[PDB]
Design a protein around this ligand. Sequence first.
Ligand SMILES: Cc1cc2ccc1[C@@H](C)COC(=O)Nc1ccc(C3(C(=O)O)CCCCC3)c(c1)CN(C)C(=O)[C@@H]2Nc1ccc2c(N)ncc(F)c2c1
Ligand SMILES: [Ca+2]
Lengths: 254, 58
Amino acid sequence: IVGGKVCPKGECPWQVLLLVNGAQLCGGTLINTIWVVSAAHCFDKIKNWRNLIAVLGEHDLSEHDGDEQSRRVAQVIIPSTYVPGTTNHDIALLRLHQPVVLTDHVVPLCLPERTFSERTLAFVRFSLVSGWGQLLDRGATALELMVLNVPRLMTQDCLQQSRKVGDSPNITEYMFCAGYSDGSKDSCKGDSGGPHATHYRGTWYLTGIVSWGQGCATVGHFGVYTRVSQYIEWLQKLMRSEPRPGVLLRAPFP
Amino acid sequence: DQLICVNENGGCEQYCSDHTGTKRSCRCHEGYSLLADGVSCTPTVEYPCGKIPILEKR
Ligand SMILES: Cc1cc2ccc1[C@@H](C)COC(=O)Nc1ccc(C3(C(=O)O)CCCCC3)c(c1)CN(C)C(=O)[C@@H]2Nc1ccc2c(N)ncc(F)c2c1
Ligand SMILES: [Ca+2]
């Protein structure tokens, strides 16, 4: 995260840290005790599928304070429509082998219903984006969980407010723009898979996933987030399914 | 058949469902129950989703 602040310990309790061989991979969002939502592109290079760990209740990477809970990832579900190395359908649904224990420091983010998310959450201007990603473009990643408040834009507004760049992906119906075009504040590649959380009448909801952009906090460009409301039914059906052998699962979308 | 949820989420704190006529039913996410006002959602569990305990206990 560029231009945010440290998320006070326990204030981003749904934040997940994904690790592969103990190394920082991506962020994710806890949506209940066994399920995590992240970005499909986080898994484009994984070979050691059996060494994927989700850490809940994490804050400071340099110290173990006892609030951290680790879980092996049993399944990584990706939509059939997602193409590795591209932008569209950037979502992954992760099944933990065993449930996390909710505590003051580990709480899931509400996955909303579709209509509610499209008709109400989609018009809440500001939302929080968080992670242990880069504090600067081409800079060090954060040791403490960072958080940033970003405004959401209508895609028409996003396109006309962004710099004219040749060979750039389209902002599809499965995406939304959020952030600033002045290069002061953004989520970064190390924040990929993390939550874009929206507050509505005293409750926080999952509305987006840190997905992509054209350089972190780059002038003339906004951050691009996966539009989670397009996946509610796909996610709900998968959470009702039995797991299959092999960590990676490609599931039909829609 | 009236459309109620299209307007300010039918007054529901969380989820809204339209029924035949002028009937509207608010609903909540798991870990919550609907209050007798038929609009508000209250936790049924100690760690309901989307609530920050250190801030809730402040
Ligand atoms: C899908 C994607 C993702 C990123 C950049 C470009 C794309 C596609 C166009 C091409 O598709 C890709 O580039 N694919 C891709 C696949 C795997 C990796 C991983 C990597 O190489 O680091 C694989 C290992 C785990 C971590 C991700 C990586 C990218 C690393 N990387 C550049 C990313 O994650 C970028 N993330 C953000 C996320 C949010 C951003 C934001 N709000 N404002 C500005 C940014 F600029 C942002 C970059
Ligand atoms: Ca720690």
